[PDB]
């Protein structure tokens, strides 16, 4: 059981780093997605002058 | 796999508890049986001395 828990501990350690790396991709995707809103809002706003 | 060993260790604990508990009761009952013989050996000693 002690050896088995060690395998679970190492397995959890791998997911710990992966969880942090996924947060960066999720956070980076959110920041990148938000940038599209600013650019998209600028296009519709630039052409808004034309009735 | 751990749950299979936990239940195994837990199950064996109950089985070993009965054997350990039975061994204790078996010793207590056997102790009185041995204690009664102590008085018997002394009675035979006094009886043998009485014959002398």
Curated annotation (Swiss-Prot), chain B:
Belongs to the methyl-accepting chemotaxis (MCP) protein family. The modification Glutamate methyl ester (Gln) is found at residue 1. Receptor for the attractant L-serine and related amino acids. Is also responsible for chemotaxis away from a wide range of repellents, including leucine, indole, and weak acids. Chemotactic-signal transducers respond to changes in the concentration of attractants and repellents in the environment, transduce a signal from the outside to the inside of the cell, and facilitate sensory adaptation through the variation of the level of methylation. Attractants increase the level of methylation while repellents decrease the level of methylation, the methyl groups are added by the methyltransferase CheR and removed by the methylesterase CheB. It is found in: Cell inner membrane. It comes from the Bacteria. This is Methyl-accepting chemotaxis protein I. The gene is tsr.
């Amino acid at each position: 059981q002690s050896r088995g828990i060690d395998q679970v501990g190492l397995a959890v350690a791998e997911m710990d780093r992966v969880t942090q790396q996924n947060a960066a991709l999720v956070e980076e995707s959110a920041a990148a997605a938000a940038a599209l809103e600013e650019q998209a809002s600028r296009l519709t706003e630039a052409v808004a002058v034309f009735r | 796999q751990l749950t299979a060993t936990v239940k195994q260790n837990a199950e064996n604990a109950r089985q070993a508890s009965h054997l350990a508990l039975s061994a204790s009761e078996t010793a207590q009952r056997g102790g009185k049986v041995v204690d009664n013989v102590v008085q018997t050996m002394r009675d035979i000693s006094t009886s043998s001395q009485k014959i002398a």
